[PDB]
Amino acid sequence: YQSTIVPVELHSFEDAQVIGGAFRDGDAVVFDMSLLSREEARRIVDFAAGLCFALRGKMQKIDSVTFAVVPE
Amino acid sequence: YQSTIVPVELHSFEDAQVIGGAFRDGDAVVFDMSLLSREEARRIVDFAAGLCFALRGKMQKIDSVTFAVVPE
């Protein structure tokens, strides 16, 4: 069974849990921050860095509004 | 062998890895943000929330400049 990257269009910092749940279960996540304020985008990236640290994953910047988190 | 909470006096956002390493190994961490700028304190708390989410831990606010992360 294939494990396609989970795409997430973010709406607020509360959606950090959507990236977190998928990544915690072992899925790569690609997320879009273009509907967020500058403040909330920063918050998401910091939360995602904490996810990656905890589970030994890697965060990749695709562009100014698109990042991916990839499991170990 | 006892597992005493790890106290961390933070100096920059780079010290998120000090909270992260201890919490990832299963230690509770109590950290002080009184030497940080407002910007960096926010960044630390968001990174710590990502750590807690990933490993099913809990973050507790002690006061405006002191928080703890506790493993599951």
Residue numbers in the entry:
A (entry chain A), B (entry chain A): 65 to 136
List sentences quoted exactly from the publication behind this structure.
At the cell division site, FtsZ protofilaments form a highly dynamic, membrane-bound structure, the Z-ring, which serves as a scaffold for the recruitment of the extra-cytoplasmic cell wall biosynthetic machinery. Here we investigate the physiological function of Corynebacterium glutamicum SepF, the only cell division-associated protein from Actinobacteria known to interact with the conserved C-terminal tail of FtsZ. Our structural data revealed the FtsZ-binding pocket, defining the SepF homodimer as the functional unit, and suggesting a reversible β-sheet-mediated oligomerization interface possibly regulated via an alpha helical switch.
To further investigate this hypothesis, we removed the helix and crystallized the resulting SepFΔML,Δα3 construct alone and in complex with FtsZCTD. Despite a different crystal packing, the two structures did show a dimer-dimer association mediated by the opposing β-sheets in the crystal, generating linear SepF polymers similar to those observed for the B. subtilis homolog. In our hands, C. glutamicum SepF devoid of helix α3 (i.e., with the β-sheet accessible for protein–protein interactions) remained dimeric in solution and we were unable to detect higher order assemblies by size exclusion chromatography or analytical ultracentrifugation.
